[PDB]
Design a protein around this ligand. Structure first.
Ligand SMILES: [Zn+2]
Ligand SMILES: [Zn+2]
Ligand SMILES: [Zn+2]
Ligand SMILES: [Zn+2]
Lengths: 194, 196
């Protein structure tokens, strides 16, 4: 029915989704600087890798979606180049740490102890040379790619291409992630027991 | 035959035991609050669009119900007929100001006062408050995961979603993709990002 040729999502998925390696123990993330790069050690497997359509997160050059996963924050350590890192917005509830010279977000931290995603850093595993990272599971904030200049009439083919890659399109997070967030909110507010 | 057990799942009285369809050239009617005497009455002098059930925590829901049913009409077609003095704004700071009868608790309409909002010029109405049939039928389920914030156990979610799909109410954790792409198109056109 729908014509899916020439639709690009993110280069990590354009030729199909790479599998995780069982027993993957982590690796290293590097910014894009030819010299004195920021290096971050990710000392665990990631979870919930997905492509993301929101305007706030780092995409490679010419990419409509970003690819972003989560790791427990104890697993993260800036190896080299911490001086080179600046926060993209200190007001943002997830605080993006970006390299000063190439503009590459090395991680995103939640400093709010009450935020649902607290304890978990947000990393772009494409910044690693090693394969075997947690595979992209879904597409998030899909309708928000329009806010970066994607033409609405392109949306049918984008979603049809996401689905053929196996990445279910959502206009928020995946349903299990959204129930996780609502449960956290409800436990904080007293709507739910605990 | 069937994969998820959906028995006992109640959504909204207006979908639980049959969904009444639209009827042709329906031209509107009157919403009444639940006060046994001197109710707020509001005229809705057009057919609604985009009726959906909604799990958010801000919409009015009849006693028992886990979803509200809410539709949209041009503000031009909506008029308070009796009982303006029994209405109060729930939260005058929300993007949608919900006008609720201070006596029975029923929201008689929701109005957007920000001229820049994607839905400006559209009121929100619970057409179950009309004793006439013929209204636009619910089309999907929105803000589904948000029913957890009102105290639904997350273990219920799978049965609840399956049951929505059995009614033809595709569940989304936001609005539906067309409405979501429309909100986005609005935002982009204002911000520069999308032409003209
Ligand atoms: Zn750099
Ligand atoms: Zn994003
Ligand atoms: Zn009343
Ligand atoms: Zn609602």
């Amino acid at each position: 029915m729908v014509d899916t040729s020439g639709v690009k999502i993110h280069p990590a998925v354009d030729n199909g989704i790479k599998p995780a390696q069982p027993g993957f123990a982590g690796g290293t993330l590097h910014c894009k600087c030819s010299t004195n790069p920021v290096r971050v050690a990710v000392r665990a497997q990631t979870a919930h890798n997905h492509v993301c359509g929101c305007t706030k997160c780092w995409k490679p050059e010419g990419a409509i979606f970003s690819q972003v996963a989560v790791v427990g924050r104890d697993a993260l350590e800036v190896l080299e180049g911490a001086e080179k890192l600046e926060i993209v917005n200190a007001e943002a509830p997830i605080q993006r740490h970006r390299c000063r010279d190439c503009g590459v977000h090395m991680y995103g931290r939640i400093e709010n102890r009450d935020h649902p995603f607290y304890g978990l850093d947000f990393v772009h595993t494409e910044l690693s040379d090693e394969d075997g990272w947690s595979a992209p599971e879904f597409a998030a904030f899909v309708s928000s790619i329009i806010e970066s200049g994607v033409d609405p009439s392109r949306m049918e083919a984008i979603r049809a291409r996401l689905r053929e890659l196996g990445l279910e399109p959502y206009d928020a997070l995946s349903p299990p992630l959204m129930d996780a967030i609502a449960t956290h909110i409800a436990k904080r507010s007293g709507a739910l027991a605990a």
